[PDB]
Design a protein around this ligand. Structure first.
Ligand SMILES: Nc1ncnc2c1ncn2[C@@H]1O[C@H](COP(=O)(O)OP(=O)(O)OP(O)(O)=S)[C@@H](O)[C@H]1O
Lengths: 154, 43, 88, 65, 178
């Protein structure tokens, strides 16, 4: 008997905390100036779709709230471009130029590198492809600050 | 420890380099794709 | 079915999960349809399937029987092709 | 038996032309050299006929006979 | 030659499997209406049997069992999108990655169903993605009174559970704005 009550109260506590987080996110997302708070980054050098812009705003909102999230957009909707826009926005406005790691399938590694170069040529892209000797050669002197902005690896 | 102005100045150089690299890649890929679609013979 | 539990799960996942379906986002998309077609077994397939189902209960595990039955449903030639007959 | 049968031009070449007058076949998926053991049902009369009116040599004399 | 050795008729291939019969009927009707069909199967030996059956029926086809080189995968994709003679492109569901853009086709036939409905959805999305201008039809072949009915049952159960869990919730900015 007590097991059911304990499990129910524990789940209720978790649900309460999650509800508080959801309310905080709802309050943050409802701030007024269609009314997208986050503008396009000048370094984006591209035109995003309305839903892509909404996704960018959601990503910035999750960053500001310091919460991790899942982007479950169905295939082909442009998750890569949304992420690139997020990185460009954070780097330009928030000053988050820091080294970011993007883990992708090896087949998608070239495509992601291409997309990064197409949208944001400003970012210092590091690609971790190659044999151990080449990887070590590229790693040589990577502890220095402002050596690479984005690293791609499988 | 770099400032926003330094980041923009470096970004100009990196953008030029990345655009040149992208142009080279796109040219090579377009040429390779055209050569794959090609089919020729001898008279 | 207890819809409250499902709503609880949705609320739990709500602050972290963002979903977008092509139907509600990209309207300019052609429709899709799904069809289910039933087929009957041939004499060879029927004999092989019945033999494997009989061998199931007696050393091969349920996974082995499962895979053999899937192969039988695919094509009986996956076990042995029909012989090419020639004189002795 | 030394019996050579041509089954067709390989399927991989079926797109080169639009009218070739050929019957295409996919590539064999086993080994190049195979050994299969089979059971042959024969009678004594069949052996007698095969050894009395031979046609297994594939030579000109067998055809002539 | 005919008196020296006898080979089984290629017609016997279709006669020993009901699936091949129905697939022949469906493929011929699909070609008559003027469509292009992608056939997905989980076994490469089945892909071999399908090669034999399609060649016996005379349907021009391409094959990708994941063993082809990546540049050769891209070449085969571009050829299928450019060449209209290739009626079908037999494929392995688990292969191809996400770089394949087979929007030239308009019909997909699953010879057998995967236990993971996400895989079948990915195979469908291989053709149903953005930039395709024709209605897409999915055909699934199932053997009666066999394990395939259980496979379909489990796949549908997983689809319903996914609908309840993710599709049940709005999980969109519209809920926050509303
Ligand atoms: N508004 C847009 N402007 C320019 N390119 C776009 C736009 N929307 C989408 N794209 C292109 O869409 C391409 C493919 O979309 P992806 O970002 O790969 O899809 P995805 O959500 O990442 O899922 P997949 O698995 O990779 S198909 C990108 O490489 C972009 O070049």
């Amino acid at each position: 008997e007590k097991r059911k009550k304990a499990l129910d109260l524990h789940l209720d506590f978790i649900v309460g905390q999650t509800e508080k987080y959801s309310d905080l996110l709802s309050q943050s997302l409802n701030q007024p100036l269609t009314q997208v708070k986050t503008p396009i980054p000048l370094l984006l050098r591209g035109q995003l779709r309305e839903y892509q812009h909404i996704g960018l705003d959601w990503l910035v909102t999750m960053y500001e709230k310091k919460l991790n999230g899942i982007l479950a957009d169905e295939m082909g909707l442009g998750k890569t471009i949304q992420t690139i826009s997020l990185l460009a926005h954070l780097a330009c406005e928030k000053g988050n130029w820091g080294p970011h790691l993007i883990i992708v399938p090896t087949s998608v590694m070239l495509n992601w590198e291409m997309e990064l170069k197409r949208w944001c040529p400003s970012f210092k892209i590091l690609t971790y492809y190659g044999a151990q000797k080449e990887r070590k050669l590229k790693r040589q002197g990577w502890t220095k600050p402002n050596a690479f902005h984005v690293c791609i690896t499988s | 420890p770099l400032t926003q102005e330094e980041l923009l100045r470096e970004a100009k150089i990196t953008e030029e380099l990345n655009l040149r690299s992208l142009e080279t890649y796109e040219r090579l890929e377009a040429d390779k794709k055209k050569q794959v679609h090609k089919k020729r013979k001898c008279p | 079915y207890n819809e409250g539990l499902v709503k609880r799960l949705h609320k739990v996942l709500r602050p972290f999960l963002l979903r977008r379906v092509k139907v509600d986002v990209e309207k300019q998309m052609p429709k899709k349809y799904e069809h289910v077609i039933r087929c009957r077994l041939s004499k060879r397939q029927r004999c092989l399937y019945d033999d494997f189902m009989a061998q199931t209960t007696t050393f091969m595990s349920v996974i082995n029987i499962l895979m053999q039955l899937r192969k039988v449903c695919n094509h009986p030639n996956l076990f042995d092709p029909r012989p090419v007959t020639s004189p002795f | 038996s030394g019996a050579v049968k041509r089954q067709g031009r390989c399927d991989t070449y079926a797109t080169e032309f639009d009218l070739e007058a050929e019957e295409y076949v996919p590539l064999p998926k086993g080994d190049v050299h195979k050994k299969k053991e089979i059971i042959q049902d024969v009678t004594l009369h069949d052996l007698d006929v095969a050894n009395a009116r031979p046609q297994g040599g594939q030579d000109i004399l067998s055809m002539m006979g | 030659c005919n008196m020296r050795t006898q080979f089984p008729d290629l017609r016997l291939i279709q006669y020993d499997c009901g699936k091949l019969q129905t697939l022949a009927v469906l493929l011929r009707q699909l070609k008559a209406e003027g469509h292009r069909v992608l056939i997905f199967t989980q076994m490469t030996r089945m892909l071999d049997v399908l090669e034999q059956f399609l060649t016996y029926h005379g349907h021009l086809y391409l094959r990708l069992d994941g063993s082809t080189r990546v540049e050769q995968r891209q070449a085969l994709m571009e050829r299928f999108n450019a060449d209209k003679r290739i009626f079908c492109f037999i494929l392995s569901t688990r292969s191809g990655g996400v770089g394949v853009n087979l929007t030239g086709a308009d019909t997909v036939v699953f010879y057998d169903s995967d236990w993971n409905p996400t895989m079948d959805a990915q195979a469908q999305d291989r053709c149903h993605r953005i930039g395709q201008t024709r209605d897409v039809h999915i055909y699934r072949l199932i053997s009666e009174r066999t394990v395939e009915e259980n496979i379909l049952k489990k796949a549908n159960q997983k689809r319903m559970l996914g609908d309840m869990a993710i599709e049940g919730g709005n999980f969109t900015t519209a809920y926050f704005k509303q």
